[PDB]
Every structure is written in structure tokens, then in C-alpha cells.
Amino acid sequence: TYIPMSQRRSWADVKPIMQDDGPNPVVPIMYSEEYKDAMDYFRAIAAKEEKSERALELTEIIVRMNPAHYTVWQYRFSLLTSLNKSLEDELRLMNEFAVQNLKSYQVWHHRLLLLDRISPQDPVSEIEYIHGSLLPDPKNYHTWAYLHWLYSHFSTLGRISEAQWGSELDWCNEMLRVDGRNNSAWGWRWYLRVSRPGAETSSRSLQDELIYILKSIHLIPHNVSAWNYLRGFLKHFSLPLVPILPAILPYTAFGFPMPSDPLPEDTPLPVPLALEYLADSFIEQNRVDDAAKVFEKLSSEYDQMRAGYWEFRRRECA
């Protein structure tokens, strides 16, 4: 059975405070006795601004019932710093919170505040945990954003070595090997290879990156992630589209990779984004009529869901 907190000697001194949203509020929620009791005493704890171990226990009980309660998460982090608690132990508790599927914006932000305050000399253990935590959800948006922050924050402090960057690309390359359609891993590769401030921009790196992109397209010619990465790559580095066209034309119905002698099975032609490449390549050659003809075919035959958009692109050329 449940023992109310008014029947506990450890809380006999505390007068609970009731929730005050008026005598007849809209969108009320039918709380359990356990959840209402904990928030009643939390309202009192926060009123007296008590920083204690029982307040710490109370915050954990509350966030186990509602992991999205941002006020209680704010008070909990204020409790950990005031009482000089073990932030490493709190990370072990956060590991259990993900095991038992207690997740939200607030749990992920709490973990970030912990790593920020711990400020470890080497955050390799946290990087490894993030990699492993992607097993149930390889595309968890909060996790990928947290990984971006971890590398960005600790590289600002100078604590990401060259070997750490190198193994991170190894891990990212493996993620795209398991599922080349993981657009989150493509975005991570863009950070590692292009956008991060310490990235190398040389002639070999541009060739290496272009080889990886074309091979990824030839493996999965209908993968939108690879096509968008290609268009962003050429645009970001102001590279022309015409030289690469021999590798793209087989999809529209030279020392860079090429498609297979017959294309892989289940590869119907033409690939709509390959046509968009051809049309933009025509525009690069200042050939507006040829570009308008490709947009017209995209609008009326090959990408009819975007018929209005491809028609708008056709009208620009004329």
C-alpha cells in the first residue's frame, strides 16, 4: 500500500502547499495520489527554498513520474550544485533513466548541464555512451544534436585530439554502411568533413569527399540523402556541376566513380534528382531552353507531386 507523506516522520515538519489554478480550471489532469502528494510537498520545498537530500529524493521521484517537468529539473540541478553532489553519480542515474525509457528535452538538457559543469579533461567516455545509446533509435534527433554540442563545446576548450576526430569519422562511416539512408549520419559527416572549424580544405580532401559521395549514390541511386549532400557540397565549395555530369547522366534515361555496367536491380529510371542535376547543369552552361525542357518533364511526368514547383522553375528560365 501507499504511505502518504503526512504519515512519514521525515516530513512531519513540512506543511504541503496545494496547486493553485483557481476553483474550476480548464484542461485539468486527474493526478494519482502519489503524483499529487509529491507535488504538494515540492511546492512547499520550493517555497522555503530548501536545498537538502530529501528535496533531492523528492525531485527524482517526481521526474520518474513526469520526465518532462522542467521546473523540477531546474530545481534538481540547483540542488546538485548547492550540495556539491557527485555529478558522476548523477550521470549513472541518467544512464538508468534512458534504460527505463524516461526521456525528454529536459533529461537530455540535464545531461548536457552535467557534462558542462564536470568539464572532463577527456570526454571520450561520454562520446562512447552516445554512440551506444543510438541502438534503439539510430535517428534520435536530441541525441544527434547533443553529439554536435559535445564535440563543438570540448573542441572550443581544445580537448578533442586528432585521433578522436579520426575515430569519430570511422564510426560515422560505419553508421552509413549499416544504413546509408540515415540522414542524421549524413549530417554528422557534414560536420566532421565540412563545417567544423578545424576541418581540412585541400585538393585531396575535396577529391576524397567527392569520391565518397558518388560511390554512395551508385550504391543507392534513389537515396535522397546522398543527392542533397552532393548538391550542398558543390554549392558550398563553388564547384561546377558539368565535370561530374558523366557520372550522373546514366540516371537521367574522367577520374571519378561511375555507375555499374547494368544498374542495380529495382532502379527505375529516370532518377528525379538526377534530372534536377541535369537541369541545373544546363543553367550552368547558360542553356535555359534545355533546362526548361527538363523542368517541364519533371513537372508533367517524372516528379508530378511537385508539378507546381517544377513549373515555377520552368518559368524562371523563360
Partner: protein
């Protein structure tokens, strides 16, 4: 008007090609294709003149959706505890959906809605997700509360707007405590930093006339740096040490692309020198239209590349298309018409796939197989409105708003927290009030651009881009706080 918006029933439905390369993304994509295509095969084409015998009828079940939302004015089961910090969102999802569905509340219920939200207003500034004696203020409930007060409140002593006007200084001070030097905002004390907070803050600041130069510094740079190589926008950008450069922190996503486009659009109204920092509008429009699914997936929108279509992105991605379209129009004009997405297919997804099965609980949902909820009900209907009504930002309407604006009327100017944080003089502050007010009321529904798939009984009311409340709510609300009549 349907020349370049073909129905999904008129197009061949074929799966995403595999290229003989199985993966987990393809497994889930093929499973949801079957789930959506089966329901379309069971449903009569809404563009048919006589409903087919044996198929389900796809008409908008507005009364079922009204009863689904009705439970919010009585009680919510215990499983709603996960939303106990988002109750202003439960209010907004309800009162805005009812506005879209054409269902009015009586004055007693509106008074309850106003009174409940005022119990969420903290004297130190801003709204929380619940009673002020239990929850600290937060940028996201602040937006939802302000918009809900615009929908359910009025200008009387019991209307709630008067209390909002009295709280303008404290809310502003709360906004400034949230501000970071790089231009980002924490959503609350010790909270996360993303473009949802920027969007929510800029909307409320625009509506309540509390925008200052110190509030906006670097805000345009934070948002602009969220644009990824795909064309859409990520949740945040990181400042490398004022900062030497800013880098996006994740994928382009429909939700954050909506907040970023809306934030940037709101900033273009501000008359500051070389502000806001530019974005790649062409790439944002391209990314938007690319997220509309194929006919086999009902023509709904997905939130990011190689993920699944979801009815809630009809508002997030579809509702961003008019904003991205206007930014593209401005850029083409600065260097010197068919719809930009399939307005018909999006309505078909809403009517066929996003509605709960008939005779059940009502409400709208993410996908077949998912329970409906208040969040997907509001955003499906908000996106449907965008598809039904052609929205555009009219420069002539904005010009007409400038001609009728009264700069001599207004609430007290807010006191900036830093000595030089306000506007330079009254001429510059009143010029800012006029531009921000005039552009906020610049969205129009184009005459003759209406497309109501399935018949006029499917028509819902017109929502406003950027703000996502009815124009008939937006005008008297913002006029109150700018003292315009």
C-alpha cells in the same frame, strides 16, 4: 486552380525503389507505404461527384473532432501527466482547432480559459506550463498562453488582455534574462537553447509591442546559421569564439525550419541597419517542397529526409511554404503563378489518412495506426487551412497599413535593462512600431485561390502564417496592444 496539383488518386502509386539495398529505413518506409495506400484503396476519391458504394466517405468529420476536443473542458485522464508542464498547449491546441472548425465557445467557458491562463502568469514575468505557484515561466507556454488569450479573451476588465498589457515590462525583463550574447535564448531558467524559443519569443514580442534593439542583437545571426546544407534549418547553431563563426548543430527538420523561417520573417519587419542577416531562401523553398511525400504515402509531409510522413508537418512544413515563397519573391524582386506544393494532395492526406476512423473517438492523428491527440488535431487542421486557402504577404496591404497607423497612440515604452538598449529616439521607435505592426497584418487570402477538396462542407477557417491564429483574432489583439482602432 488544380492544373499543377494532381490528386493522388490520379497518379500511379509505386513504392520507393530499393536498389537491391535493404536497410532499416526502407523497412519502415515500405511498411508505412502499405498502411497509407491500403486506407486510400478503402476510401472513396473525395473528388468524386457521387460517393462510391462500399468505400468509406472522406468528408471532414467536424462534429467528431469537436467532441474529441470537448473533454478538455471537463477532465483529462491520468496518462496526461506527461503534459502537466504543457497545459497552455492543451488550451491552445483546443481553442485554435475550434476556431478553425467554426465552433464558438460561450462567454462563461472563455472566462474560464482566461482565468486559468492568468493563474499561469508569474509576477516576475512570463507564463509557465501550469500554475505560477508550481512552475517557473517558460518561453513556449508563454507563446501558447498569449495566443490562447488572443483566441478566448477580450478587452473588458475580465478579458485578460488588460492583465497582459500590465505585464509587458515583466515579460520583457523575462525575455532579456533568457537572452544569450550570441543571439540565442534559453527557453527558461537553466533551459535549452533552440529556435523554438526564438520563434515563440519573437511572436509574443511582436504582438505586445515590446521589441527593442537590445532584445534583437545577434538574434538574426543565430537563426541564419541554423540553415544546413539541405536547405532547411536545424534546432540551433553553435558560436565558436563576437564569435568567429557559427555552425548548425543537427539535421534540417520541419519543426525547426518552420520556427526559423517564421523568426527570420518576423525580423525582416524590424528597421535596423543591415538587419536581419540573410538566409538562403531558394534552398529553403527547395527543401520544403521536397518533403511532400509521393502518392503512395498520401501526399503528406515528412519532417526530415528519409523519415516518415506525418500529418502534423502539414502545418510545420506546409505552413512554412508561404513564408519561404515570400522570401524568394523578395529576393527575385531585389535583383530586378502555380502553387508551390500540391495543395490538393495535402488535403487528401488530411481527409483520408489523418482523420480518426469514423464512429470512434474523433480527432486527427499522425498516421493510420496512431491514436489521435490534441497536438496532431491542431496541426493537421492548421496545415489543411494553409492548403485550402492561398496565403500571401501583400505589399500593397502593408502599404495600406502604414497609411492608417497612428504613432501617437500606444502603451508605455518598455524600460531597457541596459542604458543604451532602447531605440535612439521617438522617430526611430515609432517607425519601428509602424513597420512591425503593418507587416504583422500583411497576410491576405488571395481572392479566387481557394481550393476545397471534397466540397465546401470540408472548408475550414483561414489561419495566419507565422502566427497560426485566425486573422479575425490577430487584428483586434495586436490593435489592442498598439492602441490602434
Amino acid at each position: 486552380a488544380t492544373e499543377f496539383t494532381p490528386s493522388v488518386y490520379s497518379l500511379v502509386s509505386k513504392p520507393l525503389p530499393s536498389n537491391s539495398r535493404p536497410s532499416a529505413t526502407l523497412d519502415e518506409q515500405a511498411e508505412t507505404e502499405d498502411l497509407i495506400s491500403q486506407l486510400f484503396d478503402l476510401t472513396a476519391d473525395p473528388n468524386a461527384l457521387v460517393s462510391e458504394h462500399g468505400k468509406r466517405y472522406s468528408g471532414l468529420r467536424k462534429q467528431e473532432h469537436t467532441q474529441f476536443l470537448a473533454s478538455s473542458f471537463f477532465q483529462l485522464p491520468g496518462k496526461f501527466v506527461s503534459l502537466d508542464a504543457s497545459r497552455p498547449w492543451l488550451v491552445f491546441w483546443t481553442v485554435h482547432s475550434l476556431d478553425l472548425l467554426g465552433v464558438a465557445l460561450d462567454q462563461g467557458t472563455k472566462d474560464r480559459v482566461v482565468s486559468t491562463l492568468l493563474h499561469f502568469l508569474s509576477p516576475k514575468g512570463g507564463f509557465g506550463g501550469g500554475p505560477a505557484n508550481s512552475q517557473i515561466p517558460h518561453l513556449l507556454p508563454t507563446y501558447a498562453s498569449v495566443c490562447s488569450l488572443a483566441i478566448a479573451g477580450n478587452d473588458s476588465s475580465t478579458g485578460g488582455w488588460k492583465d497582459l498589457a500590465a505585464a509587458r515590462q515583466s515579460i520583457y525583463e523575462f525575455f532579456m534574462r533568457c537572452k544569450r550574447p550570441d543571439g540565442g535564448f534559453v527557453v527558461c531558467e537553466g533551459g535549452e537553447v533552440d529556435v523554438r524559443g526564438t520563434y515563440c519569443l519573437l511572436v509574443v514580442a511582436t504582438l505586445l509591442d515590446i521589441i527593442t534593439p537590445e532584445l534583437l542583437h545577434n538574434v538574426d545571426k543565430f537563426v541564419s546559421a541554423c540553415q544546413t546544407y539541405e536547405g532547411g534549418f536545424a534546432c540551433a547553431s553553435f558560436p565558436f569564439p563576437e564569435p568567429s563563426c557559427r555552425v548548425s548543430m543537427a539535421e534540417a527538420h520541419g519543426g525547426y525550419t518552420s520556427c526559423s523561417l517564421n523568426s527570420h520573417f518576423l525580423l525582416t519587419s524590424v528597421p535596423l541597419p543591415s538587419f536581419p542577416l540573410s538566409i538562403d531562401a531558394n534552398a529553403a523553398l527547395r527543401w520544403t517542397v521536397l518533403q511532400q511525400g509521393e502518392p503512395i504515402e498520401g501526399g503528406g509531409f515528412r519532417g526530415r529526409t528519409n523519415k516518415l510522413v506525418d500529418g502534423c508537418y502539414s502545418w510545420w512544413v506546409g505552413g512554412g511554404a508561404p513564408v519561404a515563397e515570400e522570401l524568394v519573391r523578395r529576393e527575385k524582386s531585389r535583383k530586378v503563378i502555380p502553387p508551390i506544393f500540391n495543395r490538393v494532395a495535402l488535403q487528401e492526406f488530411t481527409l483520408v489518412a489523418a482523420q480518426q476512423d469514423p464512429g470512434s473517438t474523433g480527432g486527427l492523428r499522425d498516421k493510420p495506426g496512431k491514436r489521435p491527440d490534441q497536438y496532431h488535431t491542431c496541426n493537421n487542421l492548421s496545415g489543411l487551412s494553409i492548403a485550402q486557402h492561398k496565403m500571401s504577404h501583400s505589399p500593397s496591404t502593408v502599404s495600406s497599413n502604414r497609411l492608417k497607423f497612428d504613432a501617437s497612440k500606444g502603451l508605455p515604452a518598455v524600460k531597457p535593462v541596459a542604458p543604451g538598449g532602447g531605440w535612439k529616439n521617438e522617430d526611430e521607435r515609432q517607425n519601428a512600431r509602424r513597420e512591425i505592426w503593418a507587416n504583422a497584418l500583411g497576410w491576405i487570402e488571395e481572392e479566387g485561390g481557394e481550393i476545397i477538396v471534397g466540397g465546401k462542407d470540408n472548408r475550414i477557417n483561414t489561419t495566419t502564417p507565422v502566427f497560426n491564429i485566425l486573422g479575425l483574432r490577430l487584428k483586434p489583439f495586436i490593435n489592442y496592444f498598439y492602441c490602434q482602432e
